[PDB]
Amino acid sequence: YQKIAVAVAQRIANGDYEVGEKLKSRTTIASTFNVSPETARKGLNILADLQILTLKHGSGAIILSKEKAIEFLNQYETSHSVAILKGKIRDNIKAQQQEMEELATLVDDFLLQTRAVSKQYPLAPYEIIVSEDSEHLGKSIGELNVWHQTGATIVAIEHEGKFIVSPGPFSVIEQGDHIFFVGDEDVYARMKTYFNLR
Amino acid sequence: TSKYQKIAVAVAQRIANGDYEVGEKLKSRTTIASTFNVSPETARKGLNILADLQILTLKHGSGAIILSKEKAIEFLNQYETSHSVAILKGKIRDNIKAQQQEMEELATLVDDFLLQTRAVSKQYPLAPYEIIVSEDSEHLGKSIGELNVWHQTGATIVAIEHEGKFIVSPGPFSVIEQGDHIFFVGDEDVYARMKTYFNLR
Amino acid sequence: IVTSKYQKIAVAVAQRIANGDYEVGEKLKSRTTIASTFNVSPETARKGLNILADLQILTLKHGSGAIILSKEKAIEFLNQYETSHSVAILKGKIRDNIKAQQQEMEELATLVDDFLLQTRAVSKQYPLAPYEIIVSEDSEHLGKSIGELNVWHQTGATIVAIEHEGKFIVSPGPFSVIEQGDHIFFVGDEDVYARMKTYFNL
Amino acid sequence: IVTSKYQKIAVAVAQRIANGDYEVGEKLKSRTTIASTFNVSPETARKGLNILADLQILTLKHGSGAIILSKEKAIEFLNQYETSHSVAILKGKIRDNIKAQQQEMEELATLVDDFLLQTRAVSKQYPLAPYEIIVSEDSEHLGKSIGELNVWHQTGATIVAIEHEGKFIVSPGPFSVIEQGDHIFFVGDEDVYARMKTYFNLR
DNA sequence: CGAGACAGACCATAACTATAATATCATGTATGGTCTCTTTATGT
DNA sequence: ACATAAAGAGACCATACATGATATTATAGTTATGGTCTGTCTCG
Ligand SMILES: Nc1ncnc2c1ncn2[C@@H]1O[C@@H]2COP(=O)(O)O[C@H]3[C@@H](O)[C@H](n4cnc5c(N)ncnc54)O[C@@H]3COP(=O)(O)O[C@H]2[C@H]1O
Ligand SMILES: Nc1ncnc2c1ncn2[C@@H]1O[C@@H]2COP(=O)(O)O[C@H]3[C@@H](O)[C@H](n4cnc5c(N)ncnc54)O[C@@H]3COP(=O)(O)O[C@H]2[C@H]1O
């Protein structure tokens, strides 16, 4: 709505529209500023309320003054001087980067804080107890060479409730401990084969 | 995840955990809704969705019976292969990277934009005044610096048009020949003083 | 973070169990003990107790009461609760940042549209329009007079006016002094504008 | 990025004027001439001629037609239109970029929301759950077997399975080989997970 | 010199369109409610 | 000591108070096609 006002103010102040001659029709005015008759009349009423034009005759209006349009354009340019717009857009994009940095550090803190865990049911730890007598008891996982012998990967050993994960080749499985491991049904059977718990 | 999915995945997880046996009968809709913080309608929709996958059976207006664990297990494997945290971790990192690339593109765009603009102001108090030094003056045939224009008249010369060729920001050396057009800034008083110096009244 | 009444009851009962105030063998009552204790409605209290019993924290027998079952399960449930609450708080803060950034997006869009309007309205300006630089940044040249700077000889620019506190000092002369944040209006060409920009550190 | 028919008429007529085929003092009709050439209605052609004459290029006279006035004004109008077109296409590009940013932003919002679902699902997931590592970056350790790497001695981790092409190699053993982009599943504690992360070059 | 025809401009309406507001529906929670089951007390 | 009856508590349920989101409708908007009237030019 203010676009038509500033355009007609520029045209009046330029001297193309001198004070005496009548204004163009609202149709031509609307067509020139790529706007429509409805906006046009709204802008003309605004400009009239600024005591710069009088809309008394439907065919056109007689321009009342020139310095008033100059003053209105001065106020608008003081509000909108391009350079002030350049400062505003630069500050605004610096702000843009500020919120992006804040969001980046937030998401980075979130990312580092959380530990990723899985839920694939195929790979659930089966728990088995080694109460039965075995020559394989009193021996280290590395000593028994578990995987080549049974195909099992030991995930944890429960001795007197002392749960230990990723046991390595040194941990020794005592009698009556609970061995937790992965593999398929065949691997589970082989583990019961090695320990004779089947 | 659909609102009519959270309930399905939660119920399937509880079934797979072993809380509900095959012969066991499920609780009421409002029980599930209260335990999973949803409305009874949404819980019912989720139960219907799960029954469409035939983990659950519906032979009663409100009752339901556990049917098979392995099918629910497969449903969990599908859901995990679609959402397993680590894959979401990769997505949340890649989306941040893509947004940073978009911001860099925007920064380059706006920088090129500002470089291309190079715009001037439109101040009406800054409007120039065109005078014609056609009249004889001792001040003709002299350099702006030689005349010392500002102290003498208060005017700041912005341009000396020589037969169409403007000399903007002319400096102290440019010499104003007779009949040239001097363009300058100042107030009405300054314009009068300039006409005083050049006797163009 | 806004939650539900029965959620605030459930977590409170979980902390009470963790505190050890309620014995493992005590039989509590949702209709009278819990409801009277936390001044909440009959079914609300029950909802909380059912949430606890889902996690095997409590056992709910029809017509009898809730019975304490486990301690470490309650501790684990509590810890999961703080983890989920932290995740939700971070989600809310992210959402606030997101809304602010979207609003700043529309702000930038409106600023660009207004600049397009200004650029289109240039057709009716007066010829020989002076340029305008705002000296926001600091340069040794600040706090000096035009004459001390010898501006035309440094940059090729002829200053037509300087803006300080919304006042335009048209036709400045030598004694006039450039100050930080002011708008300097000057005539010249593309080379002159670039030279002035380099000179003022901007 | 789009314009009106009368704007196109005005710019085309201005370019044709700049070509110089029309005289500096030539007269032209509209309803039976410019309208027919561009296959456009008489009033849109009038609109185009009115916007062209508004900047003091042409003069339309009631029931007389138009007369050519200025060349330099036409050139200036062409320059102004080029600048306006550049500004408009830049505006369109900015709008497209912001829309893409907003769509990606909602995507991020939903993605971080779904973490609430995964965290709430943790309460009922089976104990001793292994971790999950996606080896997307390149490490010298890639293309080697678990046994060659001697993984447990390097990181403290026990690998329970590796995912290649949506296939999980449960209970891998030594000959199994880690490949780029695969998911490595392993048991351990916080220290073990951090060690594995440092080893595979994946902050 | 007068009359008729053609062209242009202005007043106008309709169609293609987008945005903004309001209403309705769904997801939700809490409270009031009713019915069933279990436990305790009293009577035979 | 055993059986029956009554009371209390818990669970399943529905409705109302509520808020948020989505969809639809209306209004503001602009452009194009339209018609009528007036003015100017050409021809008789
Ligand atoms: N508005 C301005 N824009 C750009 N630079 C400015 C300026 N005002 C002052 N300066 C610079 O300061 C120097 C001294 O200016 P001052 O006004 O004392 O002394 C000036 C002035 O009295 C006069 N003068 C020069 N050009 C003038 C002009 N366009 N209008 C009015 N007077 C001018 O000649 C003297 C020497 O001028 P010179 O150019 O050698 O040297 C100038 C110039 O380099
Ligand atoms: N799934 C896995 N996770 C982590 N690291 C793995 C691994 N598979 C192999 N490695 C690493 O490679 C080395 C050789 O493994 P390999 O299977 O040939 O030879 C192994 C294996 O036959 C057996 N073994 C050790 N731990 C085992 C276990 N938990 N389960 C089954 N067998 C095991 O003892 C041998 C020596 O074991 P060590 O730990 O000294 O050395 C191991 C280990 O450092």
UniProtKB/TrEMBL annotation, chain B:
Keyword Transferase: no
Binding-site positions, 3',3'-c-di-AMP 2: N148, H151, I157
Key word Transmembrane helix present: no
HTH gntR-type domain: residues covered: 1-69
Recorded GO MF terms: DNA binding; DNA-binding transcription factor activity; monoatomic cation transmembrane transporter activity
Keywords annotated in UniProt: Coiled coil, DNA-binding, Transcription, Transcription regulation
Residue runs in coiled coils: 89-116
Binding site for 3',3'-c-di-AMP 1: N148, W150, H151, I157
GO terms classed as biological process: potassium ion transport
Residue span, RCK C-terminal domain: 115-200
Name listed for the protein in its UniProt record: GntR family transcriptional regulator
UniProtKB/TrEMBL annotation, chain D:
Gene Ontology MF terms in the entry: DNA binding; DNA-binding transcription factor activity; monoatomic cation transmembrane transporter activity
GO biological process, one term: potassium ion transport
Matching CDD domains: WHTH_GntR
Domain RCK C-terminal: 117-202
Sequence positions that bind 3',3'-c-di-AMP 1: N150, W152, H153, I159
One Pfam family cited in the UniProt record for this chain: GntR
Swiss-Prot/TrEMBL keywords: Coiled coil, DNA-binding, Transcription, Transcription regulation
Residue numbers binding 3',3'-c-di-AMP 2: N150, H153, I159
Coiled-coil intervals: 91-118
Chain ranges of the HTH gntR-type domain: 3-71
Protein name (database record): GntR family transcriptional regulator
Organism of derivation: Streptococcus agalactiae
Gene: BM110_ORF1201
